Scaffold this active site. Structure first.
Site, PDB file in Angstrom:
ATOM      1  N   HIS D  75       0.805  -1.213   0.000  1.00 16.73           N
ATOM      2  CA  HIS D  75       0.000   0.000   0.000  1.00 16.73           C
ATOM      3  C   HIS D  75       0.837   1.262   0.000  1.00 16.73           C
ATOM      4  CE1 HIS D  75      -2.692  -3.202   1.467  1.00 16.73           C
ATOM      5  NE2 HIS D  75      -3.548  -2.589   0.670  1.00 16.73           N
ATOM      6  N   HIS D 115      -6.768   7.125  -2.828  1.00 15.99           N
ATOM      7  CA  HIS D 115      -7.460   6.002  -2.183  1.00 15.99           C
ATOM      8  C   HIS D 115      -6.781   5.228  -1.036  1.00 15.99           C
ATOM      9  CE1 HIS D 115      -5.495   2.572  -4.257  1.00 15.99           C
ATOM     10  NE2 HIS D 115      -6.173   1.824  -3.405  1.00 15.99           N
ATOM     11  N   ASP D 116      -5.454   5.300  -0.937  1.00 14.38           N
ATOM     12  CA  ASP D 116      -4.759   4.588   0.132  1.00 14.38           C
ATOM     13  C   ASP D 116      -3.670   5.413   0.798  1.00 14.38           C
ATOM     14  OD1 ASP D 116      -5.973   2.043   0.555  1.00 14.38           O
ATOM     15  OD2 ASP D 116      -5.002   1.246  -1.246  1.00 14.38           O
ATOM     16  N   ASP D 233      -8.641  -1.254  -8.038  1.00 13.46           N
ATOM     17  CA  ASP D 233      -7.966  -1.554  -6.789  1.00 13.46           C
ATOM     18  C   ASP D 233      -7.708  -3.065  -6.633  1.00 13.46           C
ATOM     19  OD1 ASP D 233      -6.808  -0.707  -4.375  1.00 13.46           O
ATOM     20  OD2 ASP D 233      -8.639  -1.140  -3.278  1.00 13.46           O
ATOM     21  N   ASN D 236      -4.721  -6.500  -9.747  1.00 11.70           N
ATOM     22  CA  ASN D 236      -3.462  -7.217  -9.877  1.00 11.70           C
ATOM     23  C   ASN D 236      -3.557  -8.598 -10.545  1.00 11.70           C
ATOM     24  OD1 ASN D 236      -2.262  -5.946  -6.680  1.00 11.70           O
ATOM     25  ND2 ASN D 236      -2.427  -4.959  -8.695  1.00 11.70           N
ATOM     26  N   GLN D 284      -3.793 -17.054  -3.289  1.00 14.71           N
ATOM     27  CA  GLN D 284      -4.097 -16.338  -4.507  1.00 14.71           C
ATOM     28  C   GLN D 284      -5.266 -16.979  -5.215  1.00 14.71           C
ATOM     29  OE1 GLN D 284      -3.057 -13.351  -5.344  1.00 14.71           O
ATOM     30  NE2 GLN D 284      -1.977 -13.543  -3.379  1.00 14.71           N
ATOM     31  N   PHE D 287      -8.222 -16.048  -3.278  1.00 19.53           N
ATOM     32  CA  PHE D 287      -8.508 -14.627  -3.458  1.00 19.53           C
ATOM     33  C   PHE D 287      -9.225 -14.384  -4.792  1.00 19.53           C
ATOM     34  CE2 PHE D 287      -6.797 -10.262  -4.661  1.00 19.53           C
ATOM     35  CZ  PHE D 287      -7.680  -9.571  -3.844  1.00 19.53           C
TER      36      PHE D 287
HETATM   37  C1  ZAR Z   1      -4.530 -12.723  -1.185  1.00 19.69           C
HETATM   38  O1  ZAR Z   1      -4.014 -11.779  -2.113  1.00 19.69           O
HETATM   39  C2  ZAR Z   1      -4.248 -10.430  -2.155  1.00 19.69           C
HETATM   40  C3  ZAR Z   1      -5.095  -9.766  -1.209  1.00 19.69           C
HETATM   41  C4  ZAR Z   1      -5.333  -8.345  -1.261  1.00 19.69           C
HETATM   42  C5  ZAR Z   1      -6.148  -7.726  -0.340  1.00 19.69           C
HETATM   43  C6  ZAR Z   1      -6.445  -6.233  -0.316  1.00 19.69           C
HETATM   44  C7  ZAR Z   1      -7.256  -5.668   0.615  1.00 19.69           C
HETATM   45  C8  ZAR Z   1      -7.851  -6.599   1.625  1.00 19.69           C
HETATM   46  O2  ZAR Z   1      -8.591  -6.165   2.496  1.00 19.69           O
HETATM   47  N1  ZAR Z   1      -7.555  -7.961   1.565  1.00 19.69           N
HETATM   48  N2  ZAR Z   1      -6.703  -8.460   0.563  1.00 19.69           N
HETATM   49  C9  ZAR Z   1      -4.675  -7.616  -2.309  1.00 19.69           C
HETATM   50  C10 ZAR Z   1      -3.839  -8.257  -3.251  1.00 19.69           C
HETATM   51  C11 ZAR Z   1      -3.612  -9.674  -3.190  1.00 19.69           C
HETATM   52  O3  ZAR Z   1      -2.813 -10.362  -4.081  1.00 19.69           O
HETATM   53  C12 ZAR Z   1      -2.061  -9.911  -5.210  1.00 19.69           C
HETATM   54  F1  ZAR Z   1      -2.912  -9.394  -6.168  1.00 19.69           F
HETATM   55  F2  ZAR Z   1      -1.147  -8.922  -4.879  1.00 19.69           F
HETATM   56 MG    MG Z   2      -8.036   1.142   0.712  1.00 23.26          MG
HETATM   57 ZN    ZN Z   3      -5.774  -0.069  -2.469  1.00 26.57          ZN
END
Ligand code: ZAR
Ligand code: MG
Ligand code: ZN
Ligand code: ZAR
Ligand code: ZAR
Ligand code: ZAR
Ligand code: ZN
Ligand code: ZN
Lengths: 328, 328, 328, 328, 328, 328
Positions: D75, D115-116, D233, D236, D284, D287
């Site tokens: 961040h 935003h961050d 946001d 990625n 991942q 996620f």
């Molecule tokens: C578990 O992976 C990820 C989790 C987050 C992420 C962001 C905000 C949040 O609250 N929880 N997870 C953001 C990026 C990730 O992976 C990669 F794209 F960098």
């Molecule tokens: Mg944020």
């Molecule tokens: Zn962000």
């Protein structure tokens, strides 16, 4: 009776999806609607069931067909004949076995037959923007669709043109209501709502063990008939490619003269109607992606999987047009 | 200019609820609509704001008024003039302070003026059941209301009858849309839905500290304008008893000839339209209980309490008619 | 201990609606919040139930009370004390018999106590329009309400000011959540939604044979507690006229300096805050008509009819102020 | 100006999805946000459209970028720069042709940029559980997101840091509202609701013949902008694998120090934040399965099929990480 | 045949609301159900319409009535006779003119007759809490109501007790379904839902010009029949005060022995069932306020205003009991 | 202890979806329910958590298992054991991490165990049409399901068969309620409503950042438990093909004797139950298309994507059976 044998041979596929309506149009001296309507009535024994005088039926069909403009590329008697035939096939889908009464079947088919009668070749939006007398008359609300209904019903009053003469007063009332409800649903500006209600109905779908649908009340059945004729009206992309392409050529041939009309008026040229900036292929892919596929996918669900082949053809045709999109 | 002074004196109450429209009708040689419309336009400075040629305004008003049937007891130019004046008063209610644009105000008043033009004196149901050409034309859907709009807009095309000639193209489009939306809402079969949406709006009602309503989007404002003209159209029971009673006599006088028309046709005599079995008093009490009071009570809520007096008068008049109901 | 006897005699009415908080304010040397909070905790045996060190309680109350501005006419420690006492009474309503846990009761009362702490005497809108540091901080969202919570919780961290020191970690978490949820609901911009959810709950209301409400889940109970403290916060018009009038004087006395502040800034003077154009009487009638009555009427429904007297008083006070409205 | 040519060459892909932001980060002496923001403003002619003094823009960007922590692995200013650029690309999607006003476009991009800002490297949950001053301040509600907004807006007040100095008062108000609404939507705890509203919007989707979306009111447009920046946001996993992997390394590098922080505090180690028990690959895949794919699939629907490639890349990357999951 | 003339004279008021059932109970040697059922069947010509052997009818009625416990103060054959007679009257309401078929009318009346047969004098809750065999059997779900139905249907199997012997197989099936649906709706725990659906039906209420309701499908009609018998079952407070009070005495006389039973069991004494702490007057006012009035008010709406007198009587009786509430 | 080692080795897959229950049935001397229940209770440490005497548990399980008919092909102790094990696995899905209390987990598993006890091998419809004593008893409402609950609870009363002997009175009440609510939901006639509520819950789905669901109130949790056991009960088509096929053979083997029973009775042979006209393959495809897939797809959504594999298997099995459908 040389080619009259070929015509009769073509009409043998009246119950099949890809019927070659264009050939039937020629072989009949430009009377596909009269010919196809008559053969479907025979096929469904509607003449007997409702005591319709054969001479009366043909007299009406002839007049009706005459009121479809010959100088209109797409919205003409061939289109009318096509929507009629497609509704005919859809009505026979397995999932809808004995779901509809003969009166409802009659209404759906009659509605299809008149759904675009006396269509001028321009859109409702055009009629509204050019302050047409028709738009003034119908307060910019389903201008064309209202007109189609008025004309189709009006023609019944003439010389033994009243094919419904032997229906009970109650039946005549029901048929008129259903026909009005179905044709007004062919208005494209009602597509989203119609599709929405159809989706709501696909969930909460009640089917018998065998596979047939269960439609209890009228509002449920009229909703299905509406979407059915709507699917028939938007069935071109689901037909065999050779047919589909001919339709696409006709619809674009009609859109352009409107665009021309608009260029003359000095009006903003409607999208797709601009002869010098059209992307026929992209337009079809878009038309399928935003309207046709969403609708047919939902319909395929409701009558699952009787519509599986139609859906497949639609998706194949989409890819064909997709490939044809110029890469430069 | 003898009684022309009395007329001008009567028109001084144009902003008051109980205006004596019937007297004005006589004193004007049966031109209450033209007279009242003109004075309200002056009053609201609409002539200036929209560059309306005075001669054009009167020319139109005259033609419009001419299209209201003289042989029709209730739905005539006096009724039109009454709904116009009532809408005019309602628009000025405190709770609606500067809520509407001049164009919206124009639309509401114009809509009121043409809301029943060329009314034949029979109900939509009658027109539908007798298979009238008008019902055939509009597919039994808001037959009369659609017709009123068509006629009112059509008359604008004549000889400097186009009072809107100096509005921008965009304004002309908005006005037409709003007018159509308002007049189609005067159709009684849409009363329940209209009232339902109005109630939904009374809750979730957003008011400024001072007391003025807050209507953000169009659909919110057009909804209020619809219900407003609807209230004006159903305002008789809320006016001073002497006026209300005259209206009741006229509406019953009109209902009966329809009932007579139906008796001749051999048709089932519509309720209330039966000359030999009417209970004028009960009918009014019912009309107020099922339609008028529910509507005005809701309206009184929305603009609370600017409509408190009107509500009180309505309830008083209900009791009067109630007492008059024969006890035998 | 001369008048200290009178004070103790006044506090005897801690469970009664019209408690005279203003007298208690004087007799306590401007410590109504500390005094009333303490007596309510004794009354509810909360000190025992949550092992709160009496010295700790008073130490906190003193600090909290100190953070209410003395130079603020309405949003001060007397108001805080009033909302606390009113919440206390509402919590004891028959319809809510044993519905809330001791922790929930504690949260509601604690929330009331800190609901307006460190209030500057100006509205959220003022803070937003003047680009205050507080509004910048809270992104114009419930600026004051967020601030009140922050301050009230922050003060607990000081010298044995932490009255919750002996609650389990889980209890501390729940209390914090409930307190935050209740105080954020005192933001007037959330009134409409809060009231809406309350109405939705009055229908679908589940009551035991005896008459007690049935609140199963948390979101149901926290919703009632929210509306409860909201009712307490807007309870002035429902108290005995002598009290109500004093409150009205204070609130107007506070609104005007803001209006003055705005006149200096050159800002548009907020409604009601304008010293030279206020209609104190009309404002109260409006305040009751648009906010207070709609809310209390709904609350009276939920706990029917335990709140019947309060509703009656409210309606009587409305008429009193109504009569006082100048007729010229 | 040796590598300054390479930098300018990299910035040529500012309108392309896979822009190599990390290289740009180095080639710019750690000023990717300032560099990319500036080039996007040039690209969109925002400087001209809103009369933003170039010196003012860079002064602000510099300060803003400075407030992103250098010791934070994920961040930070590179992330900010990335979300900005991605929003930039998404805004240019065909389906959204001329849908947004310049002010809305400005808001979305500015919102992405801040935003961050000033992100500490720990989660909202961590801040809440450790009773941080920030959590106390914002009552455990969108703690970080609220803070980001406060800081981003606060910085505008400094030395000609106010890039919005020449917007009308009304514009400034709208921009502030939109920015606040967008950034608060980046709070992950609001993902489910946001996605739900997005799905509701994908159905009932109104598109013009050409293919462009039709967003009438503000709440519809702000909803799209919210989901857009949310997609940016969480973009990625949808970028080229080489980039995605770098991001994954950074986010895990940041999660672990938090897990370490928690191990020290004696707190329950948050999931994924545990250095000794992490399954980077599985995380991942999870996620993507639970958050990213569901979101992007919906977005791909709304702008169909402009997002088709992005969706494909996402699915490919999922399989890559899937394969990498240890089989023992 | 001395007093047998008085009995026959009493039965003359079978179509009137306040029929004196208690007198009829005595004058018939405790056979009010048999007597009243028989006279209603004669009155409705049901004997003829369904070919019911008179001897069979009486044989069944006798057995049925015998299965109502004599040692039960309220839920006995007089109550049964009362609900039957009340349903009979409600069925004849003007608003429901020719709305129900003879089979539906038969079902509603038969359902009323057996709705509480073999009632033990204790509540479902009691049966559940005491782990009764009946509650074990019916899994604590509508324990009593299920039992009533089982017994009522079982009795039909005996010696020419089958009064439905001459109904077609389809009719027997429908009647059984409707009866089961109606009696299960007398379960008080279903009151809220039933009332909710009734309200939803009062809005969207479709009425013919004359005033008669329009119930299209079964689920609409069965819903009305359910609420109807439910109204009949809770009609005591709407009957003439002399009757109402006798019922109240009986119901309290029955509640107390249950309370006694509970005191012996060592169970928590149910509310109202506690002999030493009952507030008969308050309980009635509450019963009317929370259950009876809300229900009847809604019913009065549906059949407006045929139920106006009943509503008035209910409200009068409430005030009577209200006044009787001790003031000390 | 020869094959007793194989049995213990099979039970090692108790937490895996495709557990081979049929083998376990043999290796246990037809005690799969007792064996699997016991191992799951050990596995979940329920014996300890609720102080269940091991001897008592086995005593009950033995009796319960004994009440499942041996001469019933499908609805027997193996089916019961299967639904138990499947519920066990579903309860452990990631998305439901610590969502349910131990009591709720106990209820779901106990409910599964008794869900079909004493099933006669015929459908509810059969029992209703043949006027069975069971149908008379339960008024044709969830005849079998009600019976299963009654028997399962009744058996607890015997000789130390009461495995719940050490639960607090409150716990015993909750467990009974939840068990009744869950088993009554296994009634297939409630499938549509259950699925409908599940879909409504998939939208508005509240999930924590990690991925776990958030179920606040009871009605939300009991709804999930209902659908869970319902999914378990209809899980055959989602299991490995070798298992699924065995189940299909058993269910058809049971349906046919019913069809035979119906042929003897002279009754209309139920669909699928007709030995001489069954299309086993088509029936399965239909069963999956109309019931199983719609349900599991929705469940897969709720716990996305923990159920992804199960969904895939289901779709694979559908295609297998589809292929097997005779083409002649
Ligand atoms: C578990 O992976 C990820 C989790 C987050 C992420 C962001 C905000 C949040 O609250 N929880 N997870 C953001 C990026 C990730 O992976 C990669 F794209 F960098
Ligand atoms: Mg944020
Ligand atoms: Zn962000
Ligand atoms: C039954 O009474 C009245 C009925 C109507 C009226 C108008 C349109 C309509 O459709 N039905 N009734 C209008 C006025 C009435 O009374 C009085 F106000 F003149
Ligand atoms: C509290 O009063 C009454 C309560 C009931 C009653 C009936 C069923 C029930 O479940 N609870 N109460 C029935 C009648 C009553 O009063 C009077 F009408 F006899
Ligand atoms: C048509 O197939 C099946 C039908 C059922 C089944 C269960 C209850 C019911 O009411 N109807 N069908 C259960 C299993 C089946 O197949 C296979 F999984 F064993
Ligand atoms: Zn009863
Ligand atoms: Zn089962």
């Amino acid at each position: 009776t040389e080619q009259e044998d070929v015509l009769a041979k073509e009409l043998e596929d009246v119950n099949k999806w890809g019927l070659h309506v264009f050939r039937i149009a020629e072989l009949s001296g430009n009377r596909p609607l009269t010919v196809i309507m008559h053969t479907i009535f025979q096929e469904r024994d509607l003449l007997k069931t409702f005591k319709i005088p054969v001479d009366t039926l043909i007299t009406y069909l002839m007049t009706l067909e005459d009121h479809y403009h010959a100088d209109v590329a797409y919205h003409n008697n061939i289109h009318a004949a096509d929507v009629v035939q497609s509704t005919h096939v859809l009505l026979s889908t397995p999932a809808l076995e004995a779901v509809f009464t003969d009166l409802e079947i009659l209404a759906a088919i009659f509605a299809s037959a008149i759904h675009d009668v006396d269509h001028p070749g321009v859109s409702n939006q055009f009629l509204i923007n050019t302050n047409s007398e028709l738009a003034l008359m119908y307060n910019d609300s389903s201008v064309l669709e209202n007109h189609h209904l008025a004309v189709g019903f009006k023609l019944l009053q003439e010389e033994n043109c009243d094919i419904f003469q032997n229906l009970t007063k109650k039946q005549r009332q029901s048929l008129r209501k259903m026909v009005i409800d179905i044709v007004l649903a062919t208005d494209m500006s009602k597509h989203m709502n119609l599709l929405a209600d159809l989706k709501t109905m696909v969930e909460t779908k009640k089917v018998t063990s065998s596979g047939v649908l269960l439609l209890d009340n009228y509002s449920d059945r009229i909703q299905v008939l509406q979407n059915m004729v709507h699917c028939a009206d938007l069935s071109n992309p689901t037909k065999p490619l050779q047919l589909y392409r001919q339709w696409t050529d006709r619809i674009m041939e009609e859109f352009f003269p409107q665009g021309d009309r608009e260029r003359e008026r000095g009006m903003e040229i409607s999208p797709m109607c601009d002869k010098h900036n059209a992307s026929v292929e992209k337009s079809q892919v878009g038309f399928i992606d935003y309207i046709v596929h969403p609708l047919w996918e939902t319909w395929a669900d409701l009558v699952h999987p009787d519509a599986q082949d139609i859906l497949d053809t639609l998706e194949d045709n989409r890819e064909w047009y997709q490939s044809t999109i110029p890469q430069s």
